[PDB]
Structure formats: structure tokens, C-alpha cells
Design a protein around this motif. Structure first.
Motif, PDB file in Angstrom:
ATOM      1  N   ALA A   1       0.821  -1.231   0.000  1.00  0.00           N
ATOM      2  CA  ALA A   1       0.000   0.000   0.000  1.00  0.00           C
ATOM      3  C   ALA A   1       0.836   1.254   0.000  1.00  0.00           C
ATOM      4  CB  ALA A   1      -0.939   0.027   1.219  1.00  0.00           C
ATOM      5  N   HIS A   2       2.001   1.239   0.642  1.00  0.00           N
ATOM      6  CA  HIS A   2       2.830   2.468   0.764  1.00  0.00           C
ATOM      7  C   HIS A   2       3.211   3.008  -0.604  1.00  0.00           C
ATOM      8  CE1 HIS A   2       5.445   5.246   2.988  1.00  0.00           C
ATOM      9  NE2 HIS A   2       6.274   5.129   1.933  1.00  0.00           N
TER      10      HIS A   2
ATOM     11  N   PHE B   1      -2.681  11.693  -0.195  1.00  0.00           N
ATOM     12  CA  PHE B   1      -3.260  11.107  -1.352  1.00  0.00           C
ATOM     13  C   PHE B   1      -4.802  11.051  -1.255  1.00  0.00           C
ATOM     14  CE2 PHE B   1      -4.916   7.266  -3.370  1.00  0.00           C
ATOM     15  CZ  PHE B   1      -4.524   7.473  -4.664  1.00  0.00           C
ATOM     16  N   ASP B   2      -5.293  10.527  -0.131  1.00  0.00           N
ATOM     17  CA  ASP B   2      -6.738  10.347   0.059  1.00  0.00           C
ATOM     18  C   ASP B   2      -7.519  11.654  -0.027  1.00  0.00           C
ATOM     19  OD1 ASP B   2      -6.567   7.576   0.556  1.00  0.00           O
ATOM     20  OD2 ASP B   2      -6.550   7.815   2.814  1.00  0.00           O
TER      21      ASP B   2
ATOM     22  N   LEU C   1       1.539  -1.777  10.979  1.00  0.00           N
ATOM     23  CA  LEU C   1       1.393  -1.245  12.342  1.00  0.00           C
ATOM     24  C   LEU C   1       0.846   0.191  12.270  1.00  0.00           C
ATOM     25  CD1 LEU C   1       4.672  -2.551  14.076  1.00  0.00           C
ATOM     26  CD2 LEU C   1       2.339  -3.575  13.756  1.00  0.00           C
ATOM     27  N   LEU C   2       0.027   0.519  13.252  1.00  0.00           N
ATOM     28  CA  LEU C   2      -0.666   1.832  13.309  1.00  0.00           C
ATOM     29  C   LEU C   2       0.388   2.934  13.552  1.00  0.00           C
ATOM     30  CD1 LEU C   2      -3.373   3.135  13.195  1.00  0.00           C
ATOM     31  CD2 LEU C   2      -3.631   2.891  15.707  1.00  0.00           C
ATOM     32  N   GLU C   3       1.511   2.587  14.211  1.00  0.00           N
ATOM     33  CA  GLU C   3       2.591   3.565  14.447  1.00  0.00           C
ATOM     34  C   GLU C   3       3.333   3.977  13.154  1.00  0.00           C
ATOM     35  OE1 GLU C   3       6.497   1.815  16.331  1.00  0.00           O
ATOM     36  OE2 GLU C   3       4.772   0.675  17.019  1.00  0.00           O
ATOM     37  N   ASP C   4       2.932   3.457  11.996  1.00  0.00           N
ATOM     38  CA  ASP C   4       3.627   3.873  10.767  1.00  0.00           C
ATOM     39  C   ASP C   4       3.057   5.239  10.310  1.00  0.00           C
ATOM     40  OD1 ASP C   4       4.922   4.404   8.414  1.00  0.00           O
ATOM     41  OD2 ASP C   4       4.680   2.346   7.569  1.00  0.00           O
ATOM     42  N   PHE C   5       3.688   6.295  10.866  1.00  0.00           N
ATOM     43  CA  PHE C   5       3.230   7.654  10.535  1.00  0.00           C
ATOM     44  C   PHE C   5       3.650   8.083   9.133  1.00  0.00           C
ATOM     45  CE2 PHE C   5       7.306  10.032  11.016  1.00  0.00           C
ATOM     46  CZ  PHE C   5       8.104   9.036  11.655  1.00  0.00           C
TER      47      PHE C   5
ATOM     48  N   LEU D   1       3.771   6.111   6.365  1.00  0.00           N
ATOM     49  CA  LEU D   1       2.702   5.520   5.512  1.00  0.00           C
ATOM     50  C   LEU D   1       1.421   6.395   5.682  1.00  0.00           C
ATOM     51  CD1 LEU D   1       1.183   3.183   3.875  1.00  0.00           C
ATOM     52  CD2 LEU D   1       0.625   2.281   6.177  1.00  0.00           C
ATOM     53  N   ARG D   2       0.981   6.611   6.913  1.00  0.00           N
ATOM     54  CA  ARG D   2      -0.323   7.274   7.083  1.00  0.00           C
ATOM     55  C   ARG D   2      -0.264   8.699   6.584  1.00  0.00           C
ATOM     56  NH1 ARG D   2      -1.167   8.168  11.531  1.00  0.00           N
ATOM     57  NH2 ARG D   2       0.450   6.904  12.680  1.00  0.00           N
ATOM     58  N   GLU D   3       0.871   9.430   6.749  1.00  0.00           N
ATOM     59  CA  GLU D   3       0.837  10.828   6.166  1.00  0.00           C
ATOM     60  C   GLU D   3       0.735  10.793   4.644  1.00  0.00           C
ATOM     61  OE1 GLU D   3       4.395  13.247   5.128  1.00  0.00           O
ATOM     62  OE2 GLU D   3       3.899  14.430   6.979  1.00  0.00           O
TER      63      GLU D   3
END
Ligand code: HDD
Ligand code: HDD
Lengths: 726, 726
Positions: free
Chosen positions: A184-185, B90-91, B77-81, B83-85
Motif C-alpha cells: 500500500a505504501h 493522497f486520500d 502497524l498503526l505507528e507507521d506515521f 505511511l499514514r501521512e
């Protein structure tokens, strides 16, 4: 009163063939088509007949033709609240389109299983064949905007919302069984590469550009889905005639807690069918709404889109039995190795009422699962789970998007979440937290169990260090592309070569084309050479000597990967052009229409102008469109009856119609003096396979034509079309 | 390093003809081009070469290929900031598209007046022939989405942002001199009618559907702009070859306070040129980005779009001197009655760097005027003034849209306004109100005056009751559509007939077609019967006897309304397809290109595959595209040199290339043995006007071809085209 006296403004509320009536909102076309979800929308449907025109505040408008002004040539007044409300609402009509799959077409329907699956899953919607689950399904392209064309070369989406008694399950799939990337990344990198390039936002709805091929050439994990997109898979005839796939391995979970690995499939009961490239590209110009139209019209006609839900099921102890990783979404599971179990049938039988409110605002997300289903560690699926809830926050205006009618569950939903923009539910619970005493802790948690229990994750063992690392098991890129290539028919292979050749011709930086050819040489030398020849590239010795990748678990093909290797043609819902003249042989027409009717094949009557013509026995024949008005691109076959052929024999558009249909491998049938048209398409006197000809349109002439249509296209014709200037 | 060793990934930072290099962001392609606005954007421009990849917080990323998981086959893992940023940004990439004119293409440029206009206006940007004003211009269609096609039949927008020393002036116009409707209150009705129909959201980028023609039939004010849209005005060849109009009467205000009525014009210095319908429709499929591409490529080549600003000026005392109302935006002011006075020149000479940031986010609004301009009571303009500030609140996220870099004034701006979403400016004023003492009342109001004064509205007399009433002076619908029709050449009239005929064939409900035919009978009987005939409709006796509307102030025609009546062709920047064979006669090609180069006409060398071919004298010829890859739709002429003609003579695509181009009325030139291709387009042995032919390509072969190109298309060919199946 502005409607016509004769009432011909209103389509009949009965199924009718494409073009027979103006199309209509689904609840008006098919008012007695019901399911629990369509019935639950009744609270928000609004009618119009016999109602007064009002503001949004309920104030009746007297004059909806003018602004309020000081003098009838004067300035507009600020106090015109009627004008400002109407222009404010207009000014704010649009919402952001979806980041990907912004172009899409949707319908209501229902799903029912063939048998109870309780031995392998506790999902309530699969528990009993008498369980009917309303669905809403949106098919889509990927790259283009919401105003882009339908018949592009692209992946298609295939998203189904199951309104179950135990929650919404969204099965958010595509029409190929893998994705382009592993983790996904990298999705924003891949998507940015395929999307219009950032300096000048070109091209729309097209992968044929440098940044897409730059990324592919640098990321061999893409090559498998790139093979699929280069095949005729990339250009379906219809959303009714393509497969669907969940792509990821998921889990089914039964009442015992036992986990089975599953991949999901949808198998089109209308069979698999695709356009050819020239026809698809030209069709984005002649009718960029072709797929949206044809879905809407199939449903209106009663040609309901039907698909069989299928599961590939792998026991947990079999996780490591294949030579690819089950968690790798660039790998397919060949059906020769793990067959698809046929599990139920979904029927799409009602169009929406309002495209924006039901299709544009629908929100699908693969993390919307229900007890009896669970995820795996597939690192593409894993990151999807974050994206689809995040994106809805700006796209649909906030966290109450599940209150937008189309998205509402039809089962109960109660919890302690409150407020957010445009909150509809007005909670009466004294408590907005748990644990609470003040409402005796309601609503309450529910332990998991066999039926109606709370959701509990399958307790998979996790062991490893915190790492940003790709699994070594994912590092194999060529054997699946190869398995796909070798499973195609020889004409499907020619179309793949053609697709790569055309695409890479549009890449302005020649080194990128060369790097792609290098990749193809890692898949298959014949493919690499044939693409190279078209680009004016010469393979090196090195390239000529790359060892082919290994077979997949001893497979050197699987015919289930071809569209056409195994016949599955269904002619119901296809369409034929009949080219008219100003004195048609009635007897040919009666015979044609009768035989088409018997097979559920539709027809469109075409001429050089609109209006009507009169046949030899005086039968008045209404014309649907002109030759130029409804091109051969839009039909599956062309029939030309006898009569006054001199009327059309010199018509450029009539000749070209047959030339275009012929180039695109469509069946053509010519009766009596229509056989004079053999000369425009260069047919020998003794005929050729795929041209139906006889003195008149008898029973044998129609049977032959319909046998051709069941085979979709006349592939044998391909070496003959190079000669035709069309 | 992923770039190739030879640097062929990087486009040359210098003017190059279309196709010669990949296209690039404008500050990289043309770093040396500058103006005041481009310079002021420098603080937000961001580079990339030699910089580390970071989060948006400035943290360097080590691995941008993988998510953080527990084990390399484990869960994310949820701590992957990181990836999430990346996925969060993108979203949330998309913003609402424009409610109308969502599809548009923009460039930077500059404007300069030929002389000071201080006798008639105190507008600073018009006060000094040495005062250069940066501009940003966005051209657009009206109906389709941002991802819809360019070469549709529709109105075009032509919007210019002038970054003046006394404020932003936005001149927000179209490419026809009137609009479809009289009062803003009807805009949402008209726009919903032309837009995709609400049940199924079809059709995209097309006015050929029931609800548009239903509205037109019931609202005869629309017929004037409909005539324009049905003419070839509806399908421009390029944004560079169409006219622009402000449509409304505005006012100029001089230092004395005298008001002069004005309508604004842009004159294309590349002349007026349009496609033909079949060409335009097919081109939406072959290259839906053709106009965006053509504009960007002209700028990259130094074929800068140039336009002359012009004013029609009417003294206040002449308000009532015409047969129509000057405030009625469905009426044009014939140039024969009020000539266009030349005002200044605008040159578009730099593409954007990022299409989203500069183009998609630009906000133009006709209420953005400057001292020296003012409005009138035109009741469509009056409602526009409300809409354009309103719609920006949702489209661009709030009230600070003028802080988005592209929208920022280059002149000072200070006021007491504060806060709002994504506020950039940080105000240090102790006061946020006036009058104040605590900052000595700064920033201070400024009295009106001859230069650098405060804005004061012209003190126009208003007298009348508060009414929702149309001026009776507006209730005449047919005389301007008549003047337009009679002003058109016979071939332009034929193309109008064909436009209405093709459009009305796509209307499903026949009564709507009949009602539109009746409207046409009120305009011109000849027009009305020729359309009726194509629709199989017969005019009644009553329809046959409708008196035509009166001429306009004694005018029986005005040739300024025609695209082609008065030639104003310019070949600079047009493009020729050169069809190669495997052994080209080099002296033909040398002479062709030398003559093309001397007139700034571009070429593209086409063949049956990519790569190279070698000429008779050994010259290596690089191929730009295949015949099928760069169709005749995309060029203005086709030239075929001699050599080994047998190589391509039975090539279907090469033949079809000449047939498509012939059909669409383009000049074709054939040298020596290429003359064999006469048989494919049925040219007589002695030839015909519009086909150039000779033993070789001299001197005078190229002067004849270039003379045909200056006349754009070969109109006299029209009766011959029906013969050819193309
Ligand atoms: C983490 C980012 C991400 C990744 C890796 C994927 N997607 Fe996705 N997809 C989205 C993020 C996303 C999205 C941004 O969240 C969308 C667009 C707007 C929306 O509601 O969801 C979406 C839209 C979307 C739609 C349109 C749904 C509709 O019709 O409304 C379908 C069918 C898919 N996706 C299917 C897939 C499949 C089969 C994938 C791989 C196996 C996949 N996507 C990977
Ligand atoms: C009362 C509503 C209304 C009416 C009567 C009109 N417009 Fe408009 N127009 C808009 C409301 C609007 C808008 C909603 O405000 C848009 C869309 C989004 C935006 O920023 O402005 C717009 C967009 C828009 C654009 C694109 C600007 C851009 O590139 O962003 C152009 C060129 C025009 N308009 C031109 C016209 C002309 C020449 C008209 C008649 C003479 C006209 N419009 C009538």
C-alpha cells in the motif's frame, strides 16, 4: 400544461428494449421491483407531480423566471432570497470526486446463496439459500475523472455493497485477479504515475504515457497486471461481460473458530467479451457513455446483469504449498490448482433514481466486513483498510457518511458516537459513553458466537521485528505474466503485442520503451521480439538468452485465464444494426426480427435520415438513428435485408458502416441484393467464414448469424483486415 | 542513478516544435521567460533535484517502498506515521470541480495597451502604453467534467485575470457574443438542462439530448446562442483560433466621471478556424486532450497565443438607439453598427508549473473590477456577481481563496478582514476594525480620483417598483438568430443545418424535435425545411407562412459574424502529416520541410511502425508516430513524398489516412508516384482543386500547398465527400 397531449413524454413502466422509450429513474420505470434496501429508501424519495414549486424552506414561488429588481430594467436587489437560495444551492452542487475510480455506473439488485455455507463461515448472509441480501453495485474505470470516457483501456472496478442482517459487507474488487503493486505504501506513487501528468494534466483515461511506463519499467512487480491491461481484458464489451475478483486472500471463519483462506470471484453469466482496440478508442469519441448506457438499458430491458459469486478455498495448513505467496496480490491462484466453488448468484435489477444521491455519494470500503470474514496480512489490503475510511471524510463531508441514504445499513446500528457535520440521528440515550450505569450500559457489547455475535478477530500468531521490508517470497515478477501469456489464444496474444506496441509508441522518451522491452524479454522472447519489431528495436544477444521464468506449480497454462479459449457466449441482450432502404423486403425483416426476438437479441433500424420508410408491402418502419448517428461501434452484428439496395448502394456512410463492422471482426449478414455490398469489404464470390449470405433471410440464414454472435467476433478474419482502408 | 547516461530524459530548456521533446513544467522549459506575477510566485515554487525525500514535517524517509509491519510478512502497524501521512495526503487530493467550465486549460502571459485610454477610462492598466500587466488565462468548455474531452460541440470560456497595479480585474468571457438566457435566476434551470440528465448522468460533454432541446424549445431566448453553438463556432480548431467576448455591456468611467457603455472583444491574431463535426467527434476519442495539448505545445514552440483586446463603445445618450436592448445578453451589437476599437495586445508565453496548483485552483469572477470600470443592469451579469464569490467558498475551501498563490494580487492589499479556514496572512495591525484610534485608523479609506483612487460606483438613476419582471424590451427572440444565419457562407449554413439535424436525431421524444423545428420556422424557412427534411418532418401550411423577423437596424447581414466569409488565415503553428515509405525520395522531403520551416508550419513524419527509415540518398528519417497512432484528425494537411510507394500503397491505414483527411476537407499534396493514391480518394486524372500534385515537391508544389493551408479547408470539396466510405 406543457406535456404532449398523447402522453408520449413518459416512458412505459414495463421492460422495453434499448431505444424503445426514453430512459427513466428506476422507481418510475420499475415501481414494483423491490428489495429491503430499495424499500428502506422510501423515507427520502421525493416525488414532484402535482406539487407546488417551493424554496427549500417550503415557501411557494410565484415567478421562477425572474430576479427581483428595482424597475423591470433595474438592478437586482439583495433582498431576493428566492434567487440567492436557488443560486447558492447551484453554486455548491459539486463534491470532490473519488481519488481513483471516479468514473463509475451503479445499480441495485439482490444476492442469494445456492446453499448454506455454515460449515466454512458464520457470515449470516451465507447461512441459508432462502436468505436474500439487497446489494448496490458500482462498476468503474480507475484512472479517469468522473467525466471521462467509458471504453478506455484500463482496469475496471467491481464494488458490491451487501446490506446484511449483521452489517454492511463491501466486497471491493476489480476485473483482473491481481493488482499492479505489492504494498500500500506505494499506491500514491503508482497512481500518480498512471494519472494525468502533473505539469499539464494530460492524458485523461489513458495509461499510454511516459510516467506510467517509466514506473512499470522500474517496478517489475507491475508486469503481471500490465499484461492483463494490455490484453483485451483492458477493454470490456460491457460490465456484464467481464469477471470480478477480490484480489486479496481473505479469511472465512466458521462457528468453531476455524479459518479458511479464500479468494473471491464473480463469474458473469452473460459470458466474457471485450472490444478490440481500434473500436474501443473510437467508441470513447462516438459515445463516451457507452458502458453506463448499456448497463442502464440492459436493466430497463430486463437483461439483468447476473454474476455467480465464487470462492477459491485454501486450508490454513496449505499456506505454503504453492511457489508464490498467497498474501502477494500480484500473484493469481490458477483455477487449475484451486477450483472456484460456485456459491451464489447476484442479479442487478433496478437502476437508481438519482445518479448523484445514490451513485456519486455511495461509499464502498474493503474493511467493511462482518463476523464470519476476516483479513490477512496482504500488505496491499492492510493499507487499504486505512484509506477508504480516511478518504470519505473530505469526499463526503465528514464522519456521518453512513447516514447518507444509499450507505445506511438496513440492520440495526447503535453506539456511543455523536455529532460531526450533518448529523442526522438524534440520540435519546442519556449516556454517550460506556461503561455507563445511567442507561444500564446500553447499547451493550455482544460476545462472539455462531449467529448474531460480536466481531472478534481471528487470533493469528504474529512473530517478527518491526520492519519496513518486503517479504523475500514476494520477489518474483515474471512467472505469472508468463503463465498468463501462454494461456491466451493466438489472436489474444496478437492483441497483447499490439497493445504494448501502440502504448509504447506514445512514450516520448525512447529509453523507457527499451527498458520495457527488456522486461518483456524476461517474460517471453516471442512477445518481446514482436513488440520490439514494432518499435524498431533490436534485441541484444543477452536479451535473446534470458532463461524463461519457471512454470507455476507445474502449470504451463490455464485456459480459465483466456477470455475466449473456452466458449461461453450468451447472445441475450446483444444488439444488431439493420441497415434499411426506402423499399425493404418485408419478408426478410419479419424473419430477422422474429429470430432475434427468440434469442433476446435487440435491433436498431438505421437509415440515411430520421423519420420512417415504407416497406414493399406498405409496412411503415420507424428509423431509430442514421448510419452516422449510431455507428457500428455500438452493435454486435450488422444485418442488411433486401429491397431497394440502389437506394443505399452508393451511400458512403452505409458502405463505411459495413467496413467498420468488418475491420472490428463483427458478424455481417447480407440477404438478396444486399450481397452487392460484398464488394465494399472485398468478399470472394464463394463467400467467407463470418459473412452470412443467402437469397433471402430464411431460418438457416438467421441460425448461422446467431451462431456467429454466440462466438462474439470472427477472429479468423484478422489477417484480412490489414488490407481494408477503414 | 535511474536517468539514462545520455541525458535524454530531460527536455531542452529552449523553444522546440511539437513532438520534438517531452513537455515540461513551464519554469523548467522556459526559465528565462518572466513577468511580475511569475516572479511573485517564486516564494512558493519548490524544486526537487539534489534534495532528500521527506515527510511534510521535514523528516527524511529511509525506505519509501514498504509499510512498517511486525515481520516482513506481518500486519501493518498503526505507528507507521510515514505511511499514514503519505496515504492521508493522497486520500484528500481532490477538490470539487467547477460547477460549469470544469474542463479548461490555462497559461501565463502579459498585456499591453497600444495607447493611453485616459480620455475614456481611468483604469490604470489602460493608462500607459509602457504599462505591462501580467495575465493568467484559462480557456474551457462549459458542460463536461474536468476529465471530459476538449473537441466537443459546446460554448467555450475565455477568462483572463489581469494583475493590475490597482487590483485584480477578471474579464470572464465566452467565445460567442451572447448567452443562452436573459436573467441569472434561470441559470440553474438552463445548466441542469444542458448537463448530464439526473437519473443516469448521461451524456458527458454533449448538448445532444432531450432535456437541453426540451428547454430550448420552451425558451426561445435561447435560440440565438443555440445558432452559434450549432455552427462550426461550436467546434474550434484551437483556443488560439476562436473569438472572445465579454457578452455584457459594462461601463468605462473616466476621471471626469463620464460613463461610456462598452462590450469587450478578443480578436485571435492567428485568425478564426474550426473543425468539422465528424472530425471533432472522432477527435474526442483519438485525443480527448487535443486543445489542452495544442495550447501547451504552441507555447513550448514559441507559437505564442496572441489576442487583441477591443472595445465596442456606445455613448450614454445612445442607450436606446438600437432595435434591441443593450442590457440584453441574448443580443449582439453588430460590428457594422458599432465598430470594435483596438485597445491592446495579450501574449500567452509561459505554461504553468503544476496544473492543479495554478489552473485548477485559479478563481476568476466578473465582479472583480477596478476603478475606471463599472457594471450595468444586465440581469444576467447582475446575478453572476453573487455566484462567483459564493461558489469559491466550497470549491476552494473558504474565504481566503485570494491567498492561494495563483489568485494573489501583485499590488498591495490591506484590510480589517481576519481568520477563516487556511488563513495565511498574519496581521500585525493592533486594530481589526474601523474606525479605530489605536492604529490611527490605518489602513485608511481613499477618496475616488483620477489615479490610485478608491472605488465609487457610477451614480446611475434607478427608478421603478420592486418587481420580478422581464423587461418587455427583451421579449424579441428571432431577429438576431436570423442575422447570424444570413451572415454565414453557404457552406457554414450547410454545417448549421447538419448540426441541428444530427442533434435532433439524438432526441428520443419526437415532439421535442417538432417543437424545435417550429422555432426554426420563426427564424428562417430554408433553415427550417432543410432540418425538417433530415428529420422526416413536414412543415404545416401555417409554419410555411410565418413572416420572418425584421432585420436588425436595417442590416440584412454582417460578415464579421462568419468564421470564413472574410479570410484571415495564418499557417504559423499548424501541422502537416508527412506519410513516409521505406525508401523516401530525399529531394522531395528536403524541399517540403524547407518550405514548411520558412512559414513556421510543423511536421510529423509518420510510418507503419516506430523507429527509423532510410531515404534514397541514405539519410536516416526518425518516425514520430504510426499512421493509426497520429490520425489525420490531429493535423491540418497531408503531404506524401515519392520513393517506394509500393511499400505503403496497399497499407489500409495509410490509405485510410488520406480518406479521413479528404473527407474533412484538408489540403492533400502528392508527389511523383504518391500520385497513385488518387485512386483511393477518387481524384480524376486531371485532378481537382484542393489536391496538390506534381512530378516532384518544388517550387511551386509547396506554395500551392501552403496557399491551400492559409484558407484552412477546401469548402468546394464538400459535395464530393458523400461518395467516399470514410
Ligand atoms: C491505500 C490506498 C488504496 C489501495 C492500495 C487501493 N485502493 Fe481502491 N480505492 C482507494 C484507495 C486504495 C480509495 C481512495 O479509498 C477509493 C477512492 C474513493 C473511495 O471511496 O475509495 C478507492 C476506490 C476503489 C473502487 C471504487 C469503489 C466505488 O465504486 O465507489 C474500487 C472497486 C477499488 N478501489 C478497488 C481496489 C482493489 C481491488 C485494490 C487492490 C487489490 C485497491 N482498490 C487498492
Ligand atoms: C448565476 C450564475 C452564473 C451565470 C448566469 C453565469 N456564470 Fe459563468 N460561472 C459561474 C456562474 C455563472 C460560476 C458558478 O460562478 C463559475 C463556476 C465555478 C467558478 O469559479 O465560477 C462559472 C464559471 C465560468 C468560467 C470559467 C472560469 C474559470 O476558468 O474558472 C467562464 C469563462 C464563465 N463562467 C463565463 C460566463 C459568461 C461569459 C456568462 C454569460 C455572459 C456566464 N459565465 C454566466
Amino acid at each position: 400544461s406543457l406535456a404532449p397531449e398523447d402522453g408520449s413524454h413518459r416512458p412505459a413502466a414495463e421492460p422495453t428494449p434499448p431505444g424503445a422509450q426514453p430512459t427513466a429513474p428506476g422507481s418510475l420505470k420499475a415501481p414494483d421491483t423491490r428489495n429491503e434496501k430499495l424499500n428502506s429508501l422510501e423515507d427520502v424519495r421525493k416525488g414532484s407531480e402535482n406539487y407546488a414549486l417551493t424554496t427549500n424552506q417550503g415557501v411557494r414561488i410565484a415567478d421562477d423566471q425572474n430576479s427581483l429588481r428595482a424597475g423591470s430594467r433595474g438592478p437586482t436587489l439583495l433582498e431576493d432570497f428566492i434567487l440567492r437560495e436557488k443560486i447558492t444551492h447551484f453554486d455548491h452542487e459539486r463534491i470532490p470526486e473519488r481519488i481513483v475510480h471516479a468514473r463509475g455506473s451503479a445499480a441495485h439488485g439482490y444476492f442469494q446463496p445456492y446453499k448454506s455455507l455454515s460449515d466454512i463461515t458464520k457470515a449470516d448472509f451465507l447461512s441459508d439459500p432462502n436468505k436474500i441480501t439487497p446489494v448496490f453495485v458500482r462498476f468503474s474505470t480507475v484512472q479517469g475523472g468522473a467525466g471521462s470516457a467509458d471504453t478506455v483501456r484500463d482496469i475496471r472496478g467491481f464494488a458490491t455493497k451487501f446490506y446484511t442482517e449483521e452489517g454492511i459487507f463491501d466486497l471491493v474488487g476489480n476485473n483482473t485477479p491481481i493488482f499492479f503493486i505489492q504494498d500500500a505504501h506505494k499506491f500514491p506513487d503508482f497512481v500518480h504515475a498512471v494519472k494525468p501528468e502533473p505539469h499539464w494534466a494530460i492524458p485523461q483515461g489513458q495509461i499510454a504515457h511516459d510516467t506510467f511506463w517509466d514506473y512499470v519499467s522500474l517496478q517489475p512487480e507491475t508486469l503481471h497486471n500490465v499484461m492483463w491491461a494490455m490484453s483485451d481484458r483492458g477493454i470490456p464489451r460491457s460490465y456484464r461481460t467481464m469477471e470480478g475478483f477480490g484480489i486479496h486472500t481473505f479469511r472465512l471463519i466458521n462457528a468453531e473458530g476455524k479459518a479458511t483462506f479464500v479468494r473471491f470471484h464473480w463469474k458473469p453469466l452473460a459470458g466474457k467479451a471485450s472490444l478490440v482496440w481500434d473500436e474501443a478508442q473510437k467508441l470513447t469519441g462516438r459515445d463516451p457513455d457507452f458502458h453506463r448506457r448499456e448497463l442502464w438499458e440492459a436493466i430497463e430491458a430486463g437483461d439483468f446483469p447476473e454474476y455467480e459469486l465464487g470462492f477459491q478455498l485454501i486450508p490454513e495448513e496449505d499456506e505454503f504449498k504453492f511457489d508464490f505467496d498467497l498474501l502477494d496480490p500480484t500473484k493469481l491462484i490458477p483455477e487449475e490448482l484451486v477450483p472456484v466453488q460456485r456459491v451464489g448468484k447476484m442479479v442487478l435489477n433496478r437502476n437508481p433514481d438519482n445518479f448523484f444521491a445514490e451513485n456519486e455519494q455511495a461509499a464502498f470500503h474493503p474493511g467493511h466486513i462482518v463476523p464470519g470474514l476476516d483479513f490477512t496480512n496482504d500488505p496491499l489490503l492492510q493499507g487499504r483498510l486505512f484509506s477508504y475510511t480516511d478518504t470519505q471524510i473530505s469526499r463526503l463531508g465528514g464522519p456521518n457518511f453512513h447516514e447518507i441514504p444509499i450507505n445506511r445499513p438496513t440492520c440495526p446500528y447503535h453506539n456511543f458516537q455523536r455529532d460531526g457535520m450533518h448529523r442526522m440521528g438524534i440520540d435519546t440515550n442519556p449516556a454517550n459513553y460506556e461503561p455507563n450505569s445511567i442507561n444500564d450500559n446500553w447499547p451493550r457489547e455482544t460476545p462472539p458466537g455462531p449467529k448474531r455475535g460480536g466481531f472478534e478477530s481471528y487470533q493469528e500468531r504474529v512473530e517478527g521485528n518491526k520492519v519496513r521490508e518486503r517479504s523475500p517470497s514476494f520477489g518474483e515478477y515474471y512467472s505469472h505474466p508468463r503463465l498468463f501469456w501462454l494461456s491466451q489464444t493466438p489472436f489474444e496474444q496478437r492483441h497483447i503485442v499490439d497493445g504494448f506496441s501502440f502504448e509504447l509508441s506514445k512514450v516520448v522518451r525512447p529509453y523507457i520503451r527499451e527498458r520495457v522491452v527488456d522486461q518483456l524479454a524476461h517474460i517471453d522472447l516471442t512477445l518481446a521480439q514482436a513488440v520490439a519489431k514494432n518499435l524498431g528495436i533490436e534485441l541484444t544477444d543477452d536479451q535473446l538468452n534470458i532463461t524463461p521464468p519457471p512454470d507455476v506449480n507445474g502449470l504451463k497454462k490455464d485456459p480459465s485465464l483466456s477470455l475466449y479459449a473456452i466458449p461461453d457466449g450468451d447472445v441475450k441482450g446483444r444488439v444488431v444494426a439493420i441497415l434499411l432502404n426506402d423499399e425493404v423486403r418485408s419478408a426478410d425483416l419479419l424473419a430477422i426480427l422474429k429470430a432475434l426476438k427468440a434469442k433476446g437479441v435487440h435491433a436498431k433500424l438505421l437509415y440515411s435520415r430520421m423519420g420512417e420508410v415504407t416497406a414493399d408491402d406498405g409496412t411503415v418502419l420507424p428509423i431509430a438513428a442514421t448510419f452516422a448517428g449510431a455507428p457500428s461501434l455500438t452493435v454486435d452484428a450488422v444485418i442488411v435485408p433486401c429491397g431497394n439496395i440502389a437506394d443505399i448502394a452508393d451511400n458512403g456512410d452505409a458502405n463505411y458502416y459495413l467496413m467498420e463492422a468488418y475491420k472490428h471482426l463483427k458478424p455481417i449478414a447480407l440477404a438478396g441484393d444486399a450481397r452487392k455490398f460484398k464488394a465494399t469489404i472485398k468478399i470472394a464470390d464463394q463467400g467467407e467464414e463470418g459473412i452470412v449470405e443467402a437469397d433471402s433471410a430464411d431460418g438457416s440464414f438467421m441460425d448461422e448469424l446467431l451462431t456467429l454472435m454466440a462466438a462474439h467476433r470472427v477472429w479468423s478474419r484478422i489477417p484480412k483486415i490489414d488490407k481494408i482502408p477503414a
